[PDB]
Each structure stands twice: as C-alpha cells, then as structure tokens.
Chains A and B, each alone.
Chain A
C-alpha cells in the first residue's frame, strides 16, 4: 500500500496516502 503511495506521480497527498495505509 505504502510503496504504491510512493508510486503515485514529502508532499501532503503522499503523507495522507501513507497515513491511510
């Protein structure tokens, strides 16, 4: 999940995704 978060093309949206996993 988190690795895929990182895949999306540290900014807030990434951080959200990261937190959400």
Chain B
C-alpha cells in the first residue's frame, strides 16, 4: 500500500497473511474455515495467519493454521489474469471474535464512486521497495467502467474493475495481492494487478468478487 496509513492492530479483522517461511500474499476470511485470495498466489505449503498486525513479531492474537485445500478458479488465465480468485480451506476452523472475523460476500455489485478499504503488507514505495511490519490501509474510490477501460485499453474483462487515484501517489502494490477491497461492509474486490504502483493514469485492478458469489457458495458446499 503506497500513500496509505497504519490501520491500527486488528481493526481489519478479516485480513489474513499467506505464509511459507515468509509473507507472500494476503487474503480475506469469509467464514471460520475458508479464505478468499488471488489465483495467481497459488502455491503448495501455505500457512494462513489470522489476527496479525506486526507480521515479524508474535504479539498476542495470531492463529496459525495450515491450508488443507487451495481451489484456484477452473477458468483462471495466467496471461490475462481473468478469473483471478482462489479459495483456501483451513485444516481446522479459526476461533472467531472481534479481532478475527469473517467479512460478508456482496449481494450486489458496487458502483463507480463508492469508497473502499484496501489493506496489506505489500511494498509502500512507488519507486524503490519497502515492506512494513504492521498492516497498512488505504481509502480509494471505484472508478467508472470507461475510465478503467481507458486507463488499460483492451485488458479489462467483465470480472475486473479499477479503483484508486488517477493522479498517482495512492495505490496497492506488490505483496498486497490476494488482499481485500471492502466497500460498505462487503468484499467487492481482490488485489490483483496494475501497471506499476501508484503511477499517474494507472490505477489498480481488482477481481470483481460479486461475479463469483454463487461459485464461492457452491464450491464451499461441495467441499
């Protein structure tokens, strides 16, 4: 997150970190046993880390739980990044409370102008690189279809949307992928890709979670 702020400890209680000896992606808790993240963060040997703040220090409210299943979308394309979504099953259910909590799925899509909350332990610099200890936050609006399409000619499918600042200075970045985009209390987006971090006229591009609700529900029910 470039141009964001320190969230505060456990103020984003559905924020997970994905860990295999180190932090490599984020994700969102959607119930006590399942996490949404990016298909492009698929790997083996994933540990889910819940109610983290400082990811380098044990501080008190962490639950470390191994993934027992990672289900990348069947129609995921690595070249286009279309259908960039993955479901992770926890080996055992998380204990849920105020500092570890699931985030609701959308019941409809959100519109252009809506403010959203994007979080993560990704890089904080737009040129050069710098990774934080504690969780970072950013308030950013959804952009019109046309402005998104006009920012990235031919790359925006119907399962993507942009959010951010056309002027630069404020964006998600490397390390934030898999992470949540929360708008009026719903998980609408997933940190996916963009052209640099915080570049003028290159806002971020997020997996449009409202198109996957039924899939998510049915995948969960059958696994």
A interface residues (Cβ-Cβ under 8 A, vs B): 1, 4, 7-9, 11-14, 17
- Note all chain A residues with C-beta closer than 8 A to B172: 9
Residues of B within 8 A of A8 (CB): 40, 81, 174, 177, 192-193
Residues of B within 8 A of A13 (CB): 24, 40-41, 43
Contact with A along B176-214 (1 / 0, CB 8 A): 110000000000000111110100000010000000000
Q: Which of A1, A9, A11 has the most CB of B within 10 A?
A: A9
Q: Which B residues lie within 8 Å of A7 (CB)?
A: 81, 193-195
> How many residues on the B side are at the interface (Cβ–Cβ under 8 A)?
21
Is B122 interfacial (CB 8 A cutoff)? yes
> Which residues of the other chain, A, contact B90 by a CB distance below 8 angstroms?
none
Q: Does B75 contact A (CB under 8 A)?
A: no
